[PDB]
């Protein structure tokens, strides 16, 4: 069960440097519709541990973009 956390660390770390606004929009709207978020004065903060199992598979997928061709 120590693997789960890892899935959060890597994502977290990557997200911290991630700039692809194309994804930040997808993810945000994802955890946003859920409600597991807390917006402050002027910023968007969220915890990776607040992700749902079924939502985690969708979270990691976004970053794992690709190209069908």
């Amino acid at each position: 069960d120590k693997a789960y956390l890892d899935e959060l660390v890597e994502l977290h770390r990557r997200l911290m440097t991630l700039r692809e606004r194309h994804i930040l929009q997808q993810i945000v709207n994802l955890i946003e519709e859920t409600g597991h978020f807390h917006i402050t004065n002027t910023t968007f903060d969220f915890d990776l541990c607040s992700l749902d199992k079924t939502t985690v598979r969708k979270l990691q997928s976004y970053l794992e973009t690709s190209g069908t061709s």
Partner: peptide
């Protein structure tokens, strides 16, 4: 630290919550 907070400038994204219907807790 079973928590990983990630802050994203609202300028970099768009939060859909303009004409909200109702909070209700």
């Amino acid at each position: 630290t079973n928590k990983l907070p990630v802050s994203i400038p609202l300028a970099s994204v768009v939060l859909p919550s303009r004409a909200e219907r109702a909070r209700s807790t």
